[PDB]
Design a protein around this nucleic acid. Structure first.
Lengths: 270, 119, 88, 73, 101
RNA sequence: CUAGACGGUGGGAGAGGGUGGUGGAAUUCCCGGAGUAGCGGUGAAAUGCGCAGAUACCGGGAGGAACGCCGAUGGCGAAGGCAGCCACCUGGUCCACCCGUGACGCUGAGGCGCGAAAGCGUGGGGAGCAAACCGGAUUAGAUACCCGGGUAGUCCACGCCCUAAACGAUGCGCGCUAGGUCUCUGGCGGCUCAACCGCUGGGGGCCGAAGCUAACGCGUUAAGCGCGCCGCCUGGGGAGU
């Protein structure tokens, strides 16, 4: 009884609890193609990760933003949800050669303009150098790759405030990693998310997604004397700050040193 | 390494204690001195005697690098700058301004439980 | 400007005799007519209580002239009802 | 009781809004940053009600800081 | 549209060249902006008060016009956004008040 | 028919409201810097931070929330409640010039709105401080008052209760009965006094014959004189069972 819009959150019905999905869409026929791709689940003569890993693969396809531009004039109209994650994915337009999925701020009916050109339009735009951040509203297209540029693919967050301008030239915050001023020299598409919260919005029950895309997990403690200690008591656990094969359940920190994060401090989470 | 002679001193003051600052013509300090150095803080500190023996320690590491002329300004409200006054010319120094001010939040924050209402 | 500028048209158009300074044609109409830019105070200012009740004094007049036009001359009654409807 | 020098509105070539030829905002103003209450205000209070923001602009506009300096508080 | 009053300030460090260029962008907003223009005077250069932008000095200007309400929420942002302009104040002028005069 | 109610012109007043950028003395701290032995805090002390550089001092930085001075008998305000620049929108308010509609109205268990701080939930959020919990310490005893930390919390959206030494403890409205002391505010302008003055209206502390209580005292904003109607009280406890 709050956000936009229709969340199948059935307040206890019949084998379909408080769901939560979709929105509006013009409904597109079906995607024209899907370069390269391949698949999922497992790899390298083995398998890896025993959590999730359903049926439906691919669909996502690349989304190379702006590698060139120099003068384009686009338009935008339709749109289409598709990648592995519920996040929509826009629909772009133009008429030159390729398509390249493009990003999508908030939803639109029948209009727009677009230019993708350094100094162009207040509204929706694309390609342009980086110093262009007076206010720095919703981004939803950030990226780290000089010639390239893409990154994110999720309807979660996608909104960063840009810092000032001092030595070492560092600015812009990031989704959820507090205070970590990153070095920067690229671009994005600056636009909203469309159904922000809509990314981890609850489902009814279990058995219509976890198989149907991903896989059935909520486990722990193998109770396996061999490499899995957790398991061998009257029904308690006693001591043992162990997770699995003594992997340290607690923080224990991790990656540091590194290229970057050598002048990109402050990354602590609460 | 200065030997400028004509320097200043970011004097200060506070209730419980007080701490004097001695810097150069533009800001960079030096060291520090006080009266509550040796055993004098619990109940002892309840008197300006602290601000008293404050120069009788500073001169040790201050009036050594040629400094007999210091600016003088009042900062903060101390338990007893009165004694600190004795550290005036009585110690072979110098004075400058009679300026006496102290910062205070014009409700800029949340002080203690009580801080408003009249009558 | 808010005085009677807009009301100027309500003189040779929606009014009584030449110079109607206070008839139904130019009475409660101004109220509903004001709603056009009145509900405009709802984009934000939704907390501006010092203006929201400023309309509470017209809640009556808006539907006060009833037992006088329907219960007699239907003219001043359905004068322009079919242009605003009743009970929303 | 008792007050200070005779202060009010002798001249009038000025204006409580024009900046190109600001005068009273400096001369008749407090030797401190304290927004004139009524006494030392010189004028009274009516030409101060809105005056407050008329000069406060200077603050955000860098034209003025916060307050000045004094003695004996 | 009605009578207004705006004042813009930015980076004076640049010579008169790159310091009075934004004016051009305003010119396009004087004729090519629905209505037209009004009057204009220039404060020239009046020191602020306390240091800002790490410098107690600067250069100033000022204007006064009339413009489309819609383009307003973008007219002043147009230049305030960049690291240049940092303070702006649009005010519908029409009948302010005078110190008994 | 216009005294009431109602809308017009022309002006004015402020902490009325929703939204957006933020102005800076702020104070906890991240870091470098100068670089000594204590800081802190009680009426006497301490968990803590000390030999890792503590206390403090210059700068670069993260931020959240608050808005001194004006501030006083002040204003807004049905009231709750509200004292930084500007803007989109907006509420209630003021006299003169009457413009006209022409009784068109004041109240009213029931509802709709408000819904003092805090308290519920979803997501966010975190500097300062704070219920639980926890320390040095009072004293015989101390889950009080000192100090030292910190979670929900004090914070943005939205959905709840409907409450308090919520008070002019006195329900809205009209007419009326000596005035004065003083204040924020609009207007007409008297030998045009160039620092003035009268007259008139809105809000607000005070004094009194008189009327009223059993007073204190209300005292021009009436508890003095009535009225158009809803409310409650009817010996206390137990009782908001």
């Amino acid at each position: 009884k709050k956000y936009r819009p229709y969340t199948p959150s059935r307040r206890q019905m019949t084998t379909a609890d408080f769901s939560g999905l979709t929105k509006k869409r013009p409904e597109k026929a079906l995607t024209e193609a899907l370069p390269k791709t391949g698949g999922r689940n497992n790899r390298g003569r083995i398998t890896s990760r025993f959590i999730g890993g359903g049926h439906k693969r691919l669909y996502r396809i690349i989304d190379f933003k702006r590698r060139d531009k120099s003068g384009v004039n686009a338009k935008v109209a339709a749109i289409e949800y598709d990648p592995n994650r519920s996040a929509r994915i826009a629909l772009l337009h133009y008429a030159d050669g390729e398509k390249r999925y493009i990003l999508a701020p908030e939803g639109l009916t029948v209009g727009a303009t677009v230019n993708a050109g350094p100094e162009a339009e207040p509204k929706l735009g694309n390609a342009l150098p980086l110093r262009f951040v007076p206010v720095g509203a919703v981004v939803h297209a950030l990226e780290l790759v000089p010639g390239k540029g893409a990154q994110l693919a999720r309807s979660a967050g996608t909104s960063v405030q840009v810092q000032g301008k001092e030595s070492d030239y560092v600015i812009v915050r990031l989704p959820s990693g507090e205070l970590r001023r990153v070095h920067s020299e690229c671009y994005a598409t600056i636009g909203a998310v469309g159904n922000a919260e809509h990314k981890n919005i609850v489902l009814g029950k279990a058995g219509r997604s976890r198989w149907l895309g991903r896989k059935p997990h909520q486990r722990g403690s193998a109770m396996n004397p061999v490499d899995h200690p957790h398991g061998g008591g009257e029904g308690r656990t006693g001591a043992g700050r162990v997770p699995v094969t003594p992997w340290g359940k607690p923080t224990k920190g991790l990656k540091t040193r590194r290229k970057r994060k050598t002048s990109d401090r402050f990354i602590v989470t609460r | 390494k200065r030997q400028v002679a004509s320097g200043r001193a970011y004097i200060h003051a506070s209730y419980n204690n007080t701490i004097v600052t001695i810097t150069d013509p533009d800001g960079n300090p030096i060291t520090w001195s006080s009266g509550g150095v040796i055993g004098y803080k619990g109940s002892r500190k309840g008197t300006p005697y602290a601000a008293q023996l404050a120069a009788l320690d500073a001169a040790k590491k201050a009036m050594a690098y040629g400094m007999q002329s210091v600016d003088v300004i009042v900062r903060g409200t101390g338990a007893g700058r009165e004694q600190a006054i004795r550290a005036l010319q009585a110690s072979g120094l110098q004075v400058k301004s009679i300026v006496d001010d102290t910062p205070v939040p014009h409700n800029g924050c949340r002080p203690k439980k009580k801080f408003r209402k009249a009558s | 400007p808010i005085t009677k500028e807009e009301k100027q048209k309500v003189i040779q158009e929606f009014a009584r005799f030449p110079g109607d300074t206070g008839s139904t044609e130019v009475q409660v109409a101004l109220l509903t007519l004001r709603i056009n830019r009145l509900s405009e105070h709802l984009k934000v200012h939704k907390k501006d209580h010092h203006s929201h009740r400023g309309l509470l004094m017209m809640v009556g007049q808006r539907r006060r002239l009833l037992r006088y036009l329907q219960r007699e001359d239907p003219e001043r009654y359905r004068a322009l009802i079919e242009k605003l409807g009743i009970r929303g | 009781p008792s007050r200070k020098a005779k202060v009010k509105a002798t001249l009038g070539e000025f204006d409580l809004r024009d900046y190109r030829n600001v005068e009273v905002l400096k001369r008749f103003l407090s030797e401190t940053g304290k927004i004139l209450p009524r006494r030392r205000t010189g004028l009274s209070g009516k030409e101060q009600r809105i005056l407050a923001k008329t000069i406060k602009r200077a603050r955000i506009l860098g034209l003025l800081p916060f307050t000045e300096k004094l003695v004996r508080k | 549209m009605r009578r207004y009053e705006v004042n813009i300030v930015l980076n004076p460090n640049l010579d008169q060249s790159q310091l009075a260029l934004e004016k051009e962008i305003i010119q396009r907003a004087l004729e090519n902006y629905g209505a037209r223009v009004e009057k204009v005077e220039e404060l020239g250069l009046r020191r602020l008060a306390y240091p800002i932008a790490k410098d107690p000095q600067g250069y100033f200007l000022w204007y006064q016009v009339e413009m489309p309400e819609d383009r307003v929420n973008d007219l002043a942002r147009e230049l305030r956004i960049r690291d240049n302009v940092r303070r702006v104040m649009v005010v519908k002028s029409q009948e302010p008040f005078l110190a008994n005069a």
